[PDB]
Design a protein around this ligand. Structure first.
Ligand code: 118
Lengths: 49, 465, 90, 50
DNA sequence: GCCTTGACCCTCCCCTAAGGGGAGGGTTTAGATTGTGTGCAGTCTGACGCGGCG
DNA sequence: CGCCGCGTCAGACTCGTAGGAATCTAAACCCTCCCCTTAGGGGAGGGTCAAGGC
């Protein structure tokens, strides 16, 4: 239970929803990220990626 | 050595020892036991300046018959009172004395491990032996300042003769001018040597037999120590195999190991091989006890007592099984009904099990904003309040000038304004030699005038608080 | 015998034995010098029986003390017989 | 403070045992109340509004 | 006005008899058991300075 | 002497929001100190209420 609820509540990919519009939510549910656990860091990504 | 880790540096220096077999630990324990009794032997024939058991059996005065507890102490002293009658014959080192006092040792060997009782008898000479030592240091810090002299003739014949100062006649014999270059100070040498000779009076025995058999008494106290050391050093893998089941509970690995070793050093001191059990079976208890006691005393920022630790653990154990059984988490009512405690105590316990958060906890999307940035100082006074305090002080100082000077001094003394302390009626009338009651009269005068509406509405402005 | 077993031989609480030791009414046989434990013997039970026997007549602790250690002092008993004879009437 | 003690002696007023911790509207905001919700603990007296 | 009596009054702390309840601290416990372990983190590029080996 | 390996240091500014913070087993026995229990007593220290003497 601890391992599951820590992922669903304090991860970096688990985000507070954006709810201004219908389009704001549609867009937030289709986003693709390269950050996170097992991905890049903002300071250490280059020009080519 | 191509490594800086201290856990590997430990596990490497620990592997150069061999594990013992069932006979090895028995014949190590045997010599541990017989050295500590060789010492107790050596203590036997020391003079009455020791705290010898004449009435220790009476000092105290498995449930043994009282007639058994009173009688078998009469064997040893029944022989001892007639044995050491020969303390006079042929000096102090007579052979009948050695024979029958080691027969008292034949008697002494019966006993085995005991509390510090035995300790407090050998301490009987500690407080007396090093004394002797330090006193012959005094003489030396009284000789080297005045004259220089080769130590290995002087202190050698000092060790040897100990009859009288006649050995100083062995200093002039080589005919060099350092013989009597000393002047007017040798009576200080005689001072300290004479005081240790009255120490010899109270002991009645010369030093070179006491220190002689202390040389062999020190053999037992070291031969037990060495065997204890190699009984400890052969069992460290036991500590390391036990202490690996206490990880991730507030202490680090090497802390748990160094806590277990202090318990193993006690299991080695309390062992008894005669009872027939192995060493592991007795040592595991003390090892686990030391590790468990150190987890509950350290490893929390705010420390909880041991009884509260056991209450917390019991409540955790109950809620686990109620959660497995019901499929939910039980409310404090369902825990109070089974734990059989008043519900307010169950509510009180549930607050004490939280560890403080770090002030470096990242709060936001970034990691440059921390929890400790938004924490406000609460003990500061607002500047509107400072200005109000000063304005009120000025207003009071102005209203206190209208009425009489002597009639305002009493208000200043009565409420403590502009003074280091508040005062009482009798100690104010001390300087006025006015009665207990007239002070109250003039105070009801002043406080009656000061609320007349010609004066009040300057001070009334402040009381809207 | 330790205090916990002696408390079951006599069927009395431990706080009662502590109190009786403090007052000076029932003193243990032997007290450990470093621990401070209390050990009792059979004559302690023979005396506790007398204490309870005296306590069943309504006496307070000071008169029970004065009755056990000191002389017979018969004037205290009949003097009690009035305080009961009066009390019933009340 | 001594001065405030003398003020209480003259005008006779006394303070009391409780302090005001009420909930207020933040400055600049002006609105209409449209909903209220009350959550009370099991073992506590429910009130008129709840 | 400027002081002296003799009454009255209040609050705060400690006390009664025979234990009860709890908080916080000490100690030992004898069948045998003898070398960690995370299903780790390892993950950027450029300039500069010094030691270790040919 | 020269090359290479390896270890240390650096990488723009000011604003916004966003609830809570994540595993983890000892048990029996002893001791001392502190407050609690009925229905009022007792004192210490510090205040107040009429009445006159002058
Ligand atoms: C889990 C694992 C071991 C013990 Sb234990 C013990 C506990 C109660 C009754 C008897 C034994 C233990 C001993 C000292 C300190 C702490 C715990 C225990 C000891 C030796 C061998 C096996 C178990 C407790 C829980």
């Amino acid at each position: 239970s601890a391992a599951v609820k820590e992922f669903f509540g304090s991860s970096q990919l688990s985000q507070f929803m954006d709810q201004n519009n219908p389009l704001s939510e549609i867009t937030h549910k289709r986003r693709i990220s390269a950050l996170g656990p097992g991905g890049l860091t903002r300071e250490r990504a280059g020009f080519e990626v | 050595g191509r490594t800086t880790d201290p856990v590997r540096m430990y596990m490497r220096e620990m592997g150069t020892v061999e594990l013992l077999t069932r006979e090895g630990e028995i014949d190590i324990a045997k010599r541990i036991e017989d050295g500590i009794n060789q010492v107790q032997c050596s203590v036997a024939e020391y003079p009455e300046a020791i705290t010898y058991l004449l009435e220790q059996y009476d000092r105290v005065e498995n449930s043994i018959d009282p007639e058994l507890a009173r009688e078998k102490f009469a064997e040893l002293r029944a022989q001892y009172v007639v044995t050491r009658d020969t303390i006079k014959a042929k000096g102090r080192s007579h052979a009948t004395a050695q024979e029958e006092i080691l027969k008292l040792s034949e008697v002494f060997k019966q006993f085995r491990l005991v509390p510090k009782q035995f300790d407090y008898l050998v301490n009987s000479m500690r407080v007396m032996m090093d004394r002797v030592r330090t006193q012959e240091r005094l003489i030396m810090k009284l000789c080297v300042e005045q004259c220089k002299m080769p130590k290995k003739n002087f202190i050698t014949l000092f060790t040897g003769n100990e009859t009288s100062d006649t050995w100083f006649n062995a200093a002039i014999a080589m005919n060099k001018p350092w013989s009597e270059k000393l002047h007017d100070v040798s009576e200080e040498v005689h001072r300290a040597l004479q005081k240790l000779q009255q120490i010899e009076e109270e002991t009645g025995l010369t030093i070179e037999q006491v220190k002689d058999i202390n040389r062999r008494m020190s053999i037992g106290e070291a031969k037990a120590r060495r065997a204890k050391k190699e009984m400890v050093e052969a069992n460290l893998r036991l500590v390391i195999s036990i202490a690996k089941k206490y990880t991730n509970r507030g202490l680090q690995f090497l802390d748990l190991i160094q806590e277990g070793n202090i318990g193993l050093m006690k299991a080695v001191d309390k062992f008894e091989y005669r009872r027939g059990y192995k060493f592991s079976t007795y040592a595991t208890w003390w090892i686990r006890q030391a590790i468990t006691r150190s987890i509950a005393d350290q490893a929390r920022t705010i420390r909880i007592p041991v009884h509260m630790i056991e209450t917390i653990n019991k409540l955790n154990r109950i809620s686990r099984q109620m959660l497995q059984e019901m499929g939910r988490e039980p409310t404090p009512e369902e825990l109070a009904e089974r734990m059989l405690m008043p519900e307010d105590k169950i509510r009180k316990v549930l607050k004490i099990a939280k560890e403080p958060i770090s002030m470096e906890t990242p709060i936001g999307d970034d990691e440059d904003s921390h929890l400790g940035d938004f924490i406000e100082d609460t003990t500061l006074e607002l500047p509107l309040d400072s200005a109000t305090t000063e304005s009120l002080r000025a207003a009071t100082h102005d209203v206190l000038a209208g009425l009489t000077a002597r009639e305002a001094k009493v208000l200043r003394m009565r409420f403590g304004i502009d003074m280091n302390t508040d005062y009482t009626l009798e100690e104010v009338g001390k300087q006025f030699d006015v009665t207990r009651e007239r002070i109250r009269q003039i105070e009801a005068k002043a406080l009656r005038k000061l609320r007349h509406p010609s004066r009040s509405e300057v001070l009334r402005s402040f009381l809207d608080d | 015998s330790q205090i916990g077993l002696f408390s079951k031989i006599c069927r009395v609480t431990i706080k009662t034995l502590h109190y009786y030791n403090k007052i000076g009414l029932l003193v243990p046989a032997y007290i450990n010098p470093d621990n401070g434990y209390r050990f009792y013997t059979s004559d302690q039970l023979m005396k506790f029986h007398q204490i309870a026997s005296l306590r069943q007549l309504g006496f307070t602790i000071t008169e029970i003390v004065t009755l056990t250690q000191d002389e017979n002092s018969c004037h205290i008993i009949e003097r009690r017989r009035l305080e009961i004879q009066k009390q019933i009437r009340d | 403070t001594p001065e405030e003690k003398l003020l209480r002696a003259i005008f006779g007023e006394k303070a009391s045992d409780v302090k005001d911790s009420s909930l207020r509207v933040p400055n600049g905001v002006s609105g209409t109340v449209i909903d209220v919700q009350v959550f009370t603990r099991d073992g506590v007296e429910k009130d008129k509004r709840a």
